[PDB]
Amino acid sequence: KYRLSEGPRAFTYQVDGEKKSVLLRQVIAVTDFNDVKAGTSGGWVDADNVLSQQGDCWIYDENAMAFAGTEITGNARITQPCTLYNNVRIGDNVWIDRADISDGARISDNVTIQSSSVREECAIYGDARVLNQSEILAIQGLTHEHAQILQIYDRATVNHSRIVHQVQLYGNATITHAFIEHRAEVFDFALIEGDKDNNVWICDCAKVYGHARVIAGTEEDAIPTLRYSSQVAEHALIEGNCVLKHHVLVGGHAEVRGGPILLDDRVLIEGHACIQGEILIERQVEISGRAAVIAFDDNTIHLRGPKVINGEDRITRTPL
Template identity: 30%
Template sequence: MKYELTGDTLTFQGRQLHRICALVDLPEIGVKAGDLGGWIEKVENLSQEGNAWVADEAKAYDSTLVTGNALLKNHAVAFDQTLLTDNVVVSDYAVISGEAEIRGEAKVSGGGLVTGVSLLANKAQVSEYAQVVDSSVLDEGKVLDSAQVLNGSEIRNQAIAFGNAQIRNGSVLSDEALVYGQAILSGVEMYHQSQVHGNAKVAAPGSQLFDNVNINGNTVISNAVWIHGQVKITGDVMIDKRQEIKGDFTISSQAQMESFYKWGVINESVKALPESHQADGKALLDLATKTISALSPQMQELALNNVQKQFDTLAKAHNEQMEIHHE
């Protein structure tokens, strides 16, 4: 045995807890035989094996198990059916509850909360007043400040959520993705170095952001989109049409966004042209791409209307040829 329950008791949340006392030295964590530890409800809360320890004024109760080399210290609390194992450290005023599992070398500090059916593993970090509810933080993922990760979402690799960001409804942050500020993500997947910040809201299940995409300002995306490349969307832009956005450009106004919608229509027009007119259509599109992007939003609108008219002319010419052929 490495510890025993002392006669020092404490009533906490309706449970009677007992302070522990080390019976052997635990040099890896600086504990010597005779040192007093924290509080547990029963011996089932803290393994007698390994270097697992409850220190200071920390508390473990209900069906919580602290095992392996896990350390619960300061004023941290673990209860319900939680598991702290391997080399995890839960410190300060952190709270672990529900069916949460903290594994690997994960750390929870500050006033961090991990609850529900959640998993922290590898070198994951949750700190300050961040919350992880029914979600996962893996690898070197971090949830900092007052960020919230909710409803089956996942932070992995080196992705970070911080500020007052809210990640919810099965969203995934992977690679080096960042979400911060007051941003909200709902049902969205982010990869590579993509970022969502400011007051941006991407509440569009099925959406995917790749590469170096940067969504900020007061942007609102409410329909599924696939955005990749070096695209930056800022200002008061609303995207409510299902579409793919790719390239290297900035959209900073609703007028520019409407112009982009028209690009989408024009692209579909090219695809719809018969094979005999595809070359003309693609040449026209390439020329338009090189020239229109340099224009002001107002001039882009006029230019795009003109391009659409030229595509309509191509389509009309094709239809007339087909009528002559049938005659």
């Protein structure tokens, strides 16, 4: 229960290289509902219909804007200067701390968005916490499977990352400093960790999902890059400058790191396989025992294949 201001006021809100302006009216309480006391003014709404007259949902900051088809229902909270405009949907125990929800975005259950941006039609609904300069942007998605709308929905944690097209985030996944885009998926106790020097690139259809850890290195451009159908699958550990290509899966208690590493065609690392240095594994190779393949430094090992590496195979030089 609140009332709309008597007089409007223009407001500006950034978009794509423009300075749009909208006539909003200030929201003002009337009775005490939750933690808002009767008489205190909150945010400025486009036209009562956005801020449901029911529930506890409320816009606290006197700068916050909600003006397109946006509808804030339930007990959702809007704490600081935010801007949700365009059939935006928020309405449960959702909490927006200082972000911007733009186009057809639906935030639900107990999700949390803080100082981040959610743009188009996507759905964030678990207990997902999207925060710290993150940028969610579900825009394209040509010819594949029907509007597989971009989803983040369980206990997924996105920190300073830019999730794009139709990506899915959902286990107890932890994503930090990375770029996930097309239809990639990360979703169990998966771990994505970039840093101030290198991000993490999960691209096409790739997926990360065991207790898998895809961490970035500190060397220049040490950017773990998952490119196609690839996937890190169990207790696997990928670190540093690596790029897993087409039909590639790393999954066991495998560990990959060090110099320029590339995996292509049909490759599998799955035992206690240890791979370090600049290695170029490319064809139908399998590495999965207690085997180790280590390229010292100015060296470079190149495993073409088909071939198997599983016993205490100690490779430290390219086959010939």
